[PDB]
């Protein structure tokens, strides 16, 4: 099932096809259509990005703190689950969520959705653990926030689609571009953007990836961005979504994790490689 | 019913009487007898402690790291859950559990127990946070480990009895001594012990506690140790059990958490005042 993807629109397995949650198998046996108005991956269709209009990044969550404001972002998996980075956890006094807004100032002051629990991967490697044990800092940089009450969906608030490991591996990451967004700062060490910014960044090959980094790029991450073109994610963007489009449908593929500066020559942004954490996600989500 | 505990062996609810998990109330409505052979608390009956004989610290758990071996201890609550300190979590690459063993060497070389989930208290304050938001370091130093597979209990391996906030506040914590153990260092900055050590440590008055150190213990902690007698817990003992005896049964009352050095003059060990976290524990054990 590597030649045309078995002709499946989404997921294939030898062949038999299937779709992401909230999609129905076409009358042909290969197609996938949205079986509801709140199906995942449906859209209105950071350094040097464009404003993500309302409803253009519905899966974009906002982690908010009284003193710090919006320190990170996330991605809506379902009504009561939100994916983010583990290193966004326990770095501020409080923490709550906000979805459906693209205006930074409005998010902060506005009301806030409460957080119930929070799952952090057990093998997450915080900078300190890295130096002491010589491990790759920010390895397994994945986490999931469970809301206390279900999130209300709309055409501006809907979850991103979760891919199959195989699918995300053979099709998604073999695509040309991916979308990244966040309320992070617009310039290395620069100011936080007042708006939700969005950006397209190309998958970079493993080798080019590792060789251009001062620190190890483990099998659980992947890099994206441009060699010299000054576009990239930045601080505050952590936890933010990295999705790939495939047939008018967005799937989650990465998580803003780490980087050496922001948009530097010959260097890229690092991302958690979800194709390695599908079972980890599925376990939690199904409970 | 704070009048001698209603003449009841375990828990007294105002009078109504009961017992710890795995115990049975007598016909007199006061006594508590062991329901089974693996009933909690039941026994064979660190600076300058003694070698805890096998079967004398049956609830003692050993937290094991690939490259660093035993770095902390824990306390068995049930076949599935082991109690420990939060600061023992995510401070090492891997974390496995080993029980029914008192030899440090054999534990590191032998077969380990796999850890499934780990519940770290949401309000725990690491040195990191305590400097940033002026909070009390090691406040809420508590965490629960959930094994992949049920632990096999035996003479050498059994859990400590979880008490009620009241019982622990009105009876246990009014006792003269507690018992504590671990595989930690035998002396400040010194080498870790070769074998499990066990120590009796007297309960200290919260006042003599605030007066002794630059670092005040929060209301979620309590201190225990000696003024000038070189007996205390030490690094590597964290997570270990602080148990209090009542009617030949062992109740968990504290957790080895912190302290200024080990066995210093006019200073005592700090322990997670477990009676503050009983409902917290009960929720997760459901």
């Amino acid at each position: 099932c590597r030649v045309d993807n078995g002709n499946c629109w989404h997921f294939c397995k030898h062949i038999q096809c299937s779709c992401a949650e909230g999609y129905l198998l076409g009358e042909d046996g290969h197609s996938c259509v949205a079986g509801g108005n709140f199906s995942c991956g449906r859209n209105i269709k950071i350094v040097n990005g464009m404003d993500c209009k309302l409803g253009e990044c519905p899966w974009q969550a906002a982690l908010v703190d009284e003193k710090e404001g919006v320190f990170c972002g996330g991605t809506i998996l379902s009504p009561i689950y939100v994916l983010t980075a583990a290193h966004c956890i326990n770095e501020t006094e409080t923490i709550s969520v906000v979805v459906g807004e693209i205006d930074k100032s409005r998010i902060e002051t506005g009301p806030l959705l409460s957080v119930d629990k929070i799952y952090v991967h057990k093998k997450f490697v915080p900078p300190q653990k890295a130096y002491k044990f010589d491990l790759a800092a920010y390895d397994y940089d994945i986490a999931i926030i469970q809301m206390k009450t279900p999130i209300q969906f709309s055409e501006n608030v809907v979850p991103a689609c979760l891919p199959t490991a195989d699918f995300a591996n053979q099709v998604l990451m073999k695509q040309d571009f991916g979308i990244v967004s966040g309320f992070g700062r617009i310039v290395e060490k620069g100011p936080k953007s007042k708006t939700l910014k969005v950006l397209k960044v190309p998958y970079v090959d493993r080798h080019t990836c590792m060789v251009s980094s001062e620190t190890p790029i483990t099998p659980n991450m992947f890099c994206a961005g441009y060699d010299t073109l000054p576009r990239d994610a930045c601080q505050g963007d952590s936890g933010g979504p990295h999705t790939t489009v495939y047939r008018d449908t967005h799937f989650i593929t990465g998580i803003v994790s780490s980087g050496e500066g922001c948009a530097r020559n010959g260097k890229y942004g690092n991302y958690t490689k979800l194709s390695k954490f599908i079972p980890w996600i599925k376990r939690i989500m199904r409970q | 019913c704070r009048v001698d505990n209603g003449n009841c062996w375990h828990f007294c609810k105002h009078i109504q009487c009961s017992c710890a998990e795995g115990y049975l109330l007598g016909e007199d409505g006061h006594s508590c007898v062991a329901g089974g052979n693996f009933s909690c608390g039941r026994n064979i009956k660190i600076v300058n402690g003694m070698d805890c004989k096998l079967g004398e610290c049956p609830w003692q758990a050993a937290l094991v790291d690939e490259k660093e071996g035993v770095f902390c201890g824990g306390t068995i609550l049930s076949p599935i859950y082991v109690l420990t300190a939060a600061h023992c979590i995510n401070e090492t690459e891997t974390i496995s559990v080993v029980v029914g063993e008192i030899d440090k060497s054999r534990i590191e070389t032998g077969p380990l127990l796999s850890v499934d989930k780990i519940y770290v208290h949401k309000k725990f304050v690491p040195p990191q946070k305590a400097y940033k938001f002026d909070l009390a370091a090691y406040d809420y130093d508590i965490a629960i480990i959930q094994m992949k597979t049920p632990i096999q209990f035996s003479e050498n391996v059994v859990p400590a009895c979880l008490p009620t906030a009241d019982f622990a506040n009105q009876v246990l914590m009014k006792q003269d001594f507690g018992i504590v153990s671990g595989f930690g260092r035998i002396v400040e900055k010194g080498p870790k012990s070769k074998t499990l050590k066990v120590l009796k440590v007297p309960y200290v008055d919260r006042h003599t506690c605030m007066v002794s150190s630059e670092t005040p213990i929060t209301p979620n902690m309590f201190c225990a140790g000696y003024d000038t007698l070189p007996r205390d817990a030490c690094q590597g003992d964290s997570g270990g059990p602080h148990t209090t005896v009542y009617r030949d049964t062992h109740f968990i009352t504290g957790i080895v958490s912190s302290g200024e050095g080990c066995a210093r003059n006019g200073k005592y060990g700090n322990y997670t005042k477990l009676s503050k976290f009983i409902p917290w524990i009960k929720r997760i054990m459901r």
């Binding site: 629990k117 376990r283 | 989930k117 208290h121 917290w280």
Partner: peptide
């Protein structure tokens, strides 16, 4: 609320 962070 279990007032906890779970590590899976």
């Amino acid at each position: 609320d279990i007032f906890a962070d779970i590590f899976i």
